Amino acid sequence: SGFRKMAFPSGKVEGCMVQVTCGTTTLNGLWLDDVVYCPRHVICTSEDMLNPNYEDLLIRKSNHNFLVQAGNVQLRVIGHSMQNCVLKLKVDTANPKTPKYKFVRIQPGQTFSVLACYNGSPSGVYQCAMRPNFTIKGSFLNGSCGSVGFNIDYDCVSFCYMHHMELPTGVHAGTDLEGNFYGPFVDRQTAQAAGTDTTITVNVLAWLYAAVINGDRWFLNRFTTTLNDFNLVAMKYNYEPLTQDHVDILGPLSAQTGIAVLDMCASLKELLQNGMNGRTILGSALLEDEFTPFDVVRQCSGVTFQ
Amino acid sequence: SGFRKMAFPSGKVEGCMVQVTCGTTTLNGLWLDDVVYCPRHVICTSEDMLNPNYEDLLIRKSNHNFLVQAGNVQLRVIGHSMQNCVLKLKVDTANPKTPKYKFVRIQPGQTFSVLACYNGSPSGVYQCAMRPNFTIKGSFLNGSCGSVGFNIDYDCVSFCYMHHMELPTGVHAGTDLEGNFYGPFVDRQTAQAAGTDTTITVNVLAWLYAAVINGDRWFLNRFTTTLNDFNLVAMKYNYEPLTQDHVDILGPLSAQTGIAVLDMCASLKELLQNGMNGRTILGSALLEDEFTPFDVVRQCSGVTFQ
Ligand SMILES: CNC(=O)CCCn1c(-c2cncc3ccccc23)nc2cccc(C(=O)N[C@@H](C)c3ccc4ccccc4c3)c21
Ligand SMILES: CNC(=O)CCCn1c(-c2cncc3ccccc23)nc2cccc(C(=O)N[C@@H](C)c3ccc4ccccc4c3)c21
Fold first, then answer.
1. A244-248: long-range contacts at Cβ-Cβ below 8 A with a sequence spacing of 24 or more?
2. Is the Cβ pair B122, A304 closer than 8 Å?
3. How far apart are CA A67 and CA A75, in angstroms?
4. 3-state DSSP call for residue A271?
5. B120/chain A closest Cα distance in angstroms
6. Whose CA is nearest to atom 3 of ligand 1?
7. Do residues A299 and A6 lie in contact, with contact meaning Cβ atoms separated by under 8 Å?
8. How many CB atoms lie within 10 A of CB B6?
9. Residue A48 CA: which ligand is closest?
């Protein structure tokens, strides 16, 4: 019993975090085999960020301009290349702690763990979601660029996020590990701002199924809804449209609790209408949307990775 | 910027988790040098637990009744003994991944990271507080016994909790690593229940400071108060008394923000008396009490460990 924002054990990623220094700039890099990945804006001064030309800035750099430090060991950079918005530094030592990994680009609504690091050293680990507006609500201070986000389903690390910058409203933007930004954001000092965010409807429903699994039924009602009537209502509360894909994905949780997905939609409709009336759901006084269906199955049943 | 429930990086503890089997029971052990620590109730059948004589039950067992598996590798048990409610299994092999560590007993209101494990394999990590009623609001299923809680101080792991049981309300009870229970709980099948809880006042204040640092200011006011007056309010709303030492412990945060503790207390008094009026603080509609002052400093200062 219980329900917690539960991250993956971070050790497989800890062994990968290094410090990258270029000029006066220092941030974090990810060391996998003989390559260190980090944000390409490591090569920029604050004064370059208004209109950087990365091709021009990078061609002026040599291998020994990059100081890579693993623990208190220095790694020799022997090559460098740019792939989209990430810099790949070839070093002549392969990381002996390189886990089983792959790079995955995720969809809005997906969750992952973040290992916040400073100077190549892990600070802490927390859960995040890719918001519908393609930002993440992280906790990041100066020096955190190059921190990564990942899942570790079944003993393989799936890297899905590298941290690049904080937007004016205090949320965060970055790339996948191929260097493509999530959303329309750019590694340039512009007027870019997060779009209006929405609530991840399929996740809220999953969390309501988690509450039922753990013994709370008080928010259910005798009603049902059509998919389209549910969406017409939910979008008036700035909830994301629920698709048939989302219904299908909730199937297993529907089967385990005996509550049809559109019946759970009926309950959410009423919860949006009424609020909680002084009650909580799984310790929260708000409707929580950063647990996916897969997350709920991962936690309300017991599955682990070595 | 941003504020998240942040666990410590778990890598140093992951390398210590093993699977311990005795008879039909499987749970988790903590492998440090050549000793594996786990709950002593691992030796008991369900029948035994009705009224266990652990000393007598343990003498009926021999070393090879304990099967210890570090990943794919079996460890040979060469000795066994209890300290309080913890069983100590001496093994043939010292754990080469043993971190620098201490066994520390924590106080109510202090927080720690939990590395939830099943079959000796880490599953997830989350942050918990020791409640004033000496339970923890964990997330644990069958097989999670032997999971541990810890804090990290630079390179030193401070182990402070081992998981033993879940209580009827679904909250959790355990021991320190010397096998002393937190709270008036025993490792036997008998009627046990969590006592009425209280809210950790110094932690709410710390979180209010975290909110100010992150730009949430609407609850600040012109008023200030005294310790005695505030503790009358705290007592009425089932908050822990606030002591002079709590004020001193909040000194750094009152310095980072410039808001004296008794000024912030005036804000919390008003939040308790009149509620939040549909507003939120740091993305929460209730008053969060599982962030210590040190948690706030650590997250709004970027403290790292390695
Ligand atoms: C708000 N600012 C940004 O979020 C830009 C990046 C800021 N930062 C961070 C950082 C990362 N998370 C959150 C932060 C919150 C406050 C201050 C810094 C951070 N950790 C850093 C580590 C090394 C360098 C920088 C940095 O400042 N680099 C300079 C050249 C810079 C300036 C403007 C940029 C604009 C767009 C993209 C990248 C830009 C980059 C770092
Ligand atoms: C509600 N029950 C307890 O929380 C007792 C312990 C239950 N459990 C857990 C476990 C640990 N977190 C939460 C759980 C929630 C549901 C079911 C199991 C758990 N993971 C276990 C791994 C191995 C064995 C057991 C177990 O069941 N052992 C048996 C001999 C037992 C029986 C009665 C006990 C009474 C008091 C103390 C320990 C008792 C122990 C385990």
1. A246/A201, A246/A202, A246/A205
2. yes
3. 7
4. helix
5. 8
6. A165
7. yes
8. 23
9. 1
Contact residues for B2 (Cβ-Cβ < 8 A; gap 6+): A137, A138, A139, A140, A170, A171, A172, B214
- In this structure, which topology does domain A201-300 adopt according to CATH? main proteinase (3clpro) structure, domain 3 (1.10.1840)
Neighbours of B167 (CB within 10 A): 15
Q: What residue type is assigned to position B224 of the chain?
A: T
- What CA–CA distance (Å, rounded) separates A72 from B222? 50
Return d(Cα A131, Cα A138) in angstroms, integer.
11
Nearest C-alpha in B relative to A286: B285
For residue B212, which phi and psi values (nearest 5 degrees)? -60, -50
User: Nominal resolution in Å?
Assistant: 2.2
Task: Supply the Cα-derived Rg of chain B in whole angstroms.
Answer: 22
Q: Say how many C-beta atoms besides its own lie within 10 A of residue B272's C-beta.
A: 18
Tokens of B43: 């030796």
Return all residues near B194 (Cβ < 8 A) that are at least 6 apart.
B133, B135, B167, B168, B169, B171
d(CA A18, CA A31): 7
From residue A2, alpha-carbon distances to A214, B126, B140, B281 in Å are 7, 12, 7, 23
Report the alpha-carbon distance of residue B295 to residue A305 in Å, rounded: 28
Cα dist. B124→A123, A286, A300, B156 in Å? 17, 24, 12, 21
Which residue has 């009603």 as its token pair?
A: A223
> What is the rounded CA–CA span in Å between residue A155 and residue A157?
7
C-alpha–C-alpha distance, residues A214 and A199, integer Å = 23
Name the token pair of A197.
Answer: 């965010």
Catalytic residue of the set B145, B160, B265, B300: B145
Do A260 and A209 form a contact (C-beta atoms < 8 A)? no
Establish whether domains A11-91 and A201-300 are of one fold.
Answer: no
> CA angle at residue B53 from B52 to B58, to 5 degrees?
110
**In chain B, what's the furthest Cα-to-Cα distance?**
69
Cα-Cα end-to-end distance for chain A:
23
Q: Do B124 and A285 touch (CB under 8 A)?
A: no
A11-91 under CATH 3.60.40.10, yes or no: no
Interchain CB distance below 8 Å, A139 and B2: yes
Chain A nearest-CA residue for B300: A141
Ligand 1 atom closest to Cα of residue A187: 37
In angstroms, the Cα distances linking A118 to A122, B24, B144, B157, B301 are 7, 45, 32, 19, 10
Give chain B positions within 8 Å (CB) of A286: 280, 283-285
Ligand closest to CA A191: 1
